[PDB]
Amino acid sequence: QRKLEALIRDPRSPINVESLLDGLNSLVLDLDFPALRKNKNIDNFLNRYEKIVKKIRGLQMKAEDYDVVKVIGRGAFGEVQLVRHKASQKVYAMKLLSKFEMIKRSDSAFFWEERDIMAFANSPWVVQLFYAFQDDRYLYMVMEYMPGGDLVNLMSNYDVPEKWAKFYTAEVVLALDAIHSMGLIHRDVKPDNMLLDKHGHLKLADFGTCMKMDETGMVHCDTAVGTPDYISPEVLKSQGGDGYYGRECDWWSVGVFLYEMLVGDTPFYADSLVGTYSKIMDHKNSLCFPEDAEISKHAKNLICAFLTDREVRLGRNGVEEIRQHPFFKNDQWHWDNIRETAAPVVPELSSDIDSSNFDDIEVETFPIPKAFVGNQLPFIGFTYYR
Numbered sequence: 001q002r003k004l005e006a007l008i009r010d011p012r013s014p015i016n017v018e019s020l021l022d023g024l025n026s027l028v029l030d031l032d033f034p035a036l037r038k039n040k041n042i043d044n045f046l047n048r049y050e051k052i053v054k055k056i057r058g059l060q061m062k063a064e065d066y067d068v069v070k071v072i073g074r075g076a077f078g079e080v081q082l083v084r085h086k087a088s089q090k091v092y093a094m095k096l097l098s099k100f101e102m103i104k105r106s107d108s109a110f111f112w113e114e115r116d117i118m119a120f121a122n123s124p125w126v127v128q129l130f131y132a133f134q135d136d137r138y139l140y141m142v143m144e145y146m147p148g149g150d151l152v153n154l155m156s157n158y159d160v161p162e163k164w165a166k167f168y169t170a171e172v173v174l175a176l177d178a179i180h181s182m183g184l185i186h187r188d189v190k191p192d193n194m195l196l197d198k199h200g201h202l203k204l205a206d207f208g209t210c211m212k213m214d215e216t217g218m219v220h221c222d223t224a225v226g227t228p229d230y231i232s233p234e235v236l237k238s239q240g241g242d243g244y245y246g247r248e249c250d251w252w253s254v255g256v257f258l259y260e261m262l263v264g265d266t267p268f269y270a271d272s273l274v275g276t277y278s279k280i281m282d283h284k285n286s287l288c289f290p291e292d293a294e295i296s297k298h299a300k301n302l303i304c305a306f307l308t309d310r311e312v313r314l315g316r317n318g319v320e321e322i323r324q325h326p327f328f329k330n331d332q333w334h335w336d337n338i339r340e341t342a343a344p345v346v347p348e349l350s351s352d353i354d355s356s357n358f359d360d361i362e363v364e365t366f367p368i369p370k371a372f373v374g375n376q377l378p379f380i381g382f383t384y385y386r
């Protein structure tokens with residue numbers, strides 16, 4: 001029964017006090033309705049607990065605790081805010097996830113791996129989570145602000161030379177190796193998930209697609225997940241079923257990245273989704289480089305070494321194959337020390353709320369239930385404090 005005490009005390013454990021308090025709060029939120037209270041059992045419970053549950057919710061970190069400096073991006077499940085915490089006066093990036101949209105889309109699991117990784121990864125390659133908290137309508141993740149913007153915005157503001165791509169590719173490679181070392185494969189690696197810190201250096205940021213590996217480093221996934229341009233043939237095929245693949249599905253995503261960075265378009269671009277999907281399946285035929293956009297044989301070799309079948313893909317035998325590829329040989333940095341060299345683009349920040357490397361941006365609650373629907377159950381255990 002001291003064994004029990006350990007589980008509760010561990011912030012990594014799904015039955016820690018904050019997750020047990022989520023448990024009581026979500027039960028009271030999903031029972032307290034006129035209809036359900038006709039049930040004695042439910043009235044007896046809500047009479048006993050409802051009052052103290054409100055008192056507790058009082059102390060819980062709220063949205064109003066933060067000033068919203070401005071919006072730096074909008075997802076399908078809601079927006080990411082540059083915010084300043086009122087009390088501490090510290091600046092964060094806060095991601096909102098609409099519980100209504102996640103419930104409605106039958107999509108209320110993706111965030112667990114994302115929270116786990118940002119909360120506990122403790123890597124200089126992984127954007128860091130300080131606070132997860134929820135209210136009746138929203139999930140909140142309060143992360144460190146990455147004021148350098150994403151690479152999608154860098155690549156569209158600069159002609160990127162090989163010397164830059166070497167750097168940015170190496171940092172992505174080390175970042176994924178970090179993610180892999182935590183027993184996770186990422187699956188949706190792309191420039192939108194690659195963020196630049198105050199010093200111009202890279203950090204992975206979106207993790208909704210990440211999956212625990214077997215004891216044998218494989219996964220059984222029968223869902224084709226991640227964004228179409230950057231998805232691997234093996235992951236696309238695995239929608240047809242009997243999906244069984246390892247982390248080499250991420251080295252594909254890097255090859256695609258490297259191609260886009262040097263060529264100027266994705267290598268399997270098409271007008272439709274199903275067009276891009278068709279091209280990717282046919283990658284032995286479909287991949288080729290424009291008769292102009294010039295690329296050193298080393299760069300072109302690495303790309304094609306990455307954009308092959310899983311069985312012969314660079315990084316199957318491990319990440320050191322990648323590291324000692326001719327393309328990466330350079331005078332600026334070694335792999336031991338890259339993240340303390342000078343980045344190709346060091347951002348010009350004016351203040352702690354400068355969001356100039358982010359483009360500008362510019363009503364749907366739940367209905368009262370008939371009987372128990374359990375709308376808050378999918379988010380028991382989210383709440384996290386550092």
Ligand SMILES: Cc1[nH]ncc1-c1cc2nc([C@@H]3CC4CCN3CC4)[nH]c(=O)c2s1
Nearest residue numbers: 073074075080093127143144145146205206
């Ligand atoms: C932590 C941090 N510091 N500075 C910026 C950021 C982040 C910004 C961001 N943006 C998104 C958005 C939502 C959808 C639409 C486009 N992006 C992908 C999905 N997702 C994310 O995880 C993150 S982290």
